[PDB]
Amino acid sequence: SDGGAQDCCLKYSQRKIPAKVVRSYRKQEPSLGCSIPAILFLPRKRSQAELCADPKELWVQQLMQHLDKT
Template sequence: MRNSRILLLCILGAALLSSVMSNSSAGGPDECCFKYYPRRLNKNLIRSYYMTDYRCSKTGAILVTQKSRHICVDPSLSWVETIMRSLDEKTF
């Protein structure tokens, strides 16, 4: 009787541990913008961009420079929209 309880506890512990381990990677977004870069950037220095995850508290665009630096900017600014539009047109 005692052995069956220990076995049951071990199985229950393993099940709980596996569920915690599988959910640890789905906890949240990998990259969010908490502060925007304050100055305007030259569009010739930007190689690409991507948007932050919808789960981030601030919507942000991350501009990737020619030297592979990732810079968070406000996507609603006109100069950022111009850069994103220009990069989108280059891909077509």
């Protein structure tokens, strides 16, 4: 949105983005923002911004474990 991202989760996973091509994720504060946390995908590529994904998906949940590992 013009000004930033006010609404929780800017985009949803229309494509499947593996933890191989992303380095880390970004957590969405679920207390002040929205009751459900969000997983932001920060890819190795920087052509796009942080893409939010639905973390209830198994693959996103799996990525969390790889991506948290630095």
